[PDB]
């Protein structure tokens, strides 16, 4: 089998990308943010909180004929931006893209963050990292991937992210019309339960590439780029004016800048990031200074090709026995 989703960006600034998801019997379709970054499916449901809600679409178990309590078990999720949610469990029918797995965990969230009751355009998380990850207790729960890959023609997911545009979800096969070139594959370690591996270095604009293990990981789910103070003030560098600002929370930038590209090493081959793709916009509302894409992993603990960086690539989650990433211009 194979599936085939169009995931949208939720704002102009491209902040995050939502793909529509059926879930249930009749269908309920909620539109999830995708994230190889967790581990979990959860979503706004009828035990909600209600105070918690403010827009977003709702499953209700109940409405489900195939939907059933899975007795006993709780999730509690939190976020490297410090967001968190928590629950209860049911097991129904998940189709992405015209793929179906049932007996899918359905996390069904009784609390949410005020960070995600804000944003009304997210009904909820599809985590596709490692299932080590997934947070269902006492019984941990497989992902989405995990329950379909055996059914898939190859045991893969694809991310194909727009700038500034929609773009697709693909499981169980490689769209060869969707990237030009090459797929490089790079090795992955799963220890952390990420989609972690080494990139090989980077460049700036047209500087010369500078050969440099980078460990991080491939995050669907993150925004932005984080990487190593020393990458991040080199390119900082080349934009005049712009600053570290404690009070803002990173790089910001004059908004009239034109912004350098950067490049990052995928073995010998290269992904591109355009300039413009690093620019996030006004700190506020009418601010000339503007917020940058590319930020420190120093207090995160570990880096973070976020999207920023992936949607400057075709990528491929290859979850073979030896699991591996590829990365192809697109």
């Given at each position: 089998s194979t599936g085939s989703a169009t995931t949208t960006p939720i704002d102009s600034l491209d902040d995050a990308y939502i793909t529509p998801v059926q879930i249930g019997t009749p269908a309920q379709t909620l539109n999830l943010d995708f994230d190889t970054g967790s581990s979990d499916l959860w979503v706004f449901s009828s035990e909600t909180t209600a105070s918690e809600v403010d827009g977003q679409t709702i499953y209700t178990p109940s409405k489900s004929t195939t939907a059933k309590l899975l007795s006993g078990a709780t999730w509690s999720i939190s976020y490297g931006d410090g967001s968190?949610?928590?629950?209860?469990?049911?097991?129904?029918?998940?189709?992405?893209?015209?793929?179906?797995?049932?007996?899918?965990?359905?996390?069904?969230?009784?609390?949410?963050?005020?960070?995600?009751?804000?944003?009304?355009?997210?009904?909820?998380?599809?985590?596709?990292?490692?299932?080590?990850?997934?947070?269902?207790?006492?019984?941990?729960?497989k992902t989405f991937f995990d329950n379909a890959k055996a059914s898939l023609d190859s045991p893969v997911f694809t991310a194909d992210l727009g700038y500034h545009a929609p773009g697709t979800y693909n499981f169980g096969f490689i769209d060869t019309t969707a990237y030009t070139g090459s797929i490089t594959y790079t090795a992955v370690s799963t220890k952390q339960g990420f989609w972690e591996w080494t990139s090989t270095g980077y460049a700036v604009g047209s500087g010369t590439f500078k050969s440099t293990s980078i460990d991080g990981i491939a995050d669907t789910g993150t925004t932005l780029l984080y990487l190593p103070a020393t990458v991040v003030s080199a390119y900082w560098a080349q934009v005049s004016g712009a600053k570290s600002?404690?009070?803002?929370?990173?790089?910001?930038?004059?908004?009239?800048?034109?912004?350098?590209?950067?490049?990052?090493?995928?073995?010998?081959?290269?992904?591109?990031?355009?300039?413009?793709?690093?620019?996030?916009?006004?700190?506020?509302?009418?601010?000339?200074?503007?917020?940058?894409?590319?930020?420190?992993?120093?207090?995160?603990?570990?880096?973070?090709?976020?999207?920023?960086?992936?949607?400057?690539?075709?990528?491929?989650?290859?979850?073979?026995?030896?699991?591996?990433?590829?990365?192809?211009?697109?």
């Open positions: 968190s949610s928590s629950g209860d469990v049911y097991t129904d029918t998940v189709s992405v893209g015209g793929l179906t797995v049932t007996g899918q965990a359905v996390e069904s969230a009784k609390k949410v963050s005020s960070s995600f009751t804000e944003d009304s355009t997210i009904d909820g998380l599809l985590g596709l990292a490692f299932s080590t990850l997934n947070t269902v207790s006492p019984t941990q729960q600002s404690s009070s803002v929370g990173g790089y910001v930038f004059p908004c009239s800048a034109t912004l350098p590209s950067f490049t990052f090493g995928v073995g010998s081959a290269r992904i591109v990031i355009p300039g413009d793709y690093i620019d996030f916009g006004p700190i506020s509302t009418g601010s000339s200074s503007c917020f940058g894409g590319i930020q420190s992993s120093a207090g995160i603990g570990i880096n973070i090709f976020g999207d920023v960086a992936l949607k400057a690539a075709f990528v491929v989650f290859n979850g073979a026995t030896t699991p591996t990433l590829g990365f192809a211009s697109k």
